[PDB]
Amino acid sequence: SHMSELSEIDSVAGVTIYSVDGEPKSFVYKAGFAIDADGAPNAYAPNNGGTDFTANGGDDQGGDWWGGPVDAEGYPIKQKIFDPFPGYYVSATAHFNPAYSEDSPYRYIDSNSIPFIVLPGNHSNGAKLGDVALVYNEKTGDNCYAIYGDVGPSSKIGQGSVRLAQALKIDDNPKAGGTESRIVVTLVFPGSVGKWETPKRWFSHANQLTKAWGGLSRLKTLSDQL
């Protein structure tokens, strides 16, 4: 394809975020890819039983716990017999399905099964949780549609779900996976969805926007500009 016209709109951690001039509206950045296991129902459990170390969700003994919802005494909610991993903690994502209660793993986006990206807090650049994106790994040639599913630290950029890592052929392990190399190009369509909907529906919408925008071929050429 031809090169795209790019206009800087933001910068986080040395990564420039560009509006892609034209329609449909989109922005793009090239960054590393840290693993966000948030929302996976096996991410966190007592005594380091999860796929991540427990302390990466905070203090599970009544202290500051950010991994997910807590009970009235500040301890993480444990999954029930009707939840995917009974006795593990409920891990939360910023994006959620309103059909389920705050204490339910089903309210959150399962990182193991759903391709999702993280955007830095205070750096959404017009995107709303549930909006779609096209994600491309320039070193493997792999790609995947994804939703904006979680919010990261305001000072960090380039992170996504276990399943997105799998789709991109990046090591998906929450404890040692991901990459610091700036090899992932993320094209976000702000204003595209802005709510929870079934993955079949948002994936189809991502496909329609990507076709209108010029397809992976255009993003491949654009990656050489970043």
Numbering used by the authors: -1 to 224
Give the text the authors published on this PDB structure.
We focus on AMGs that potentially encode chitosanase enzymes that metabolize chitin – a common carbon polymer. The structure consisted of two non-contiguous structural domains. Our rigorous analyses not only resulted in a crystal structure of a soil viral AMG product, but also enabled us to propose the mode of action of this previously uncharacterized chitosanase enzyme in the GH75 family of glycosyl hydrolases.
Based upon a partial alignment of the V-Csn, A. fumigatus, F. solani, and S. avermitilis sequences, the corresponding residues in V-Csn are D148 and E157. Two V-Csn constructs harboring either a D148N substitution or a E157Q substitution were generated, and the activities of the respective mutant enzymes measured. Both constructs eluted with gel-filtration chromatography retention times identical to native V-Csn, and circular dichroism spectra indicated both constructs were folded. In both cases the carboxylate was converted to the corresponding amide, generating the mutant proteins D148N and E157Q.
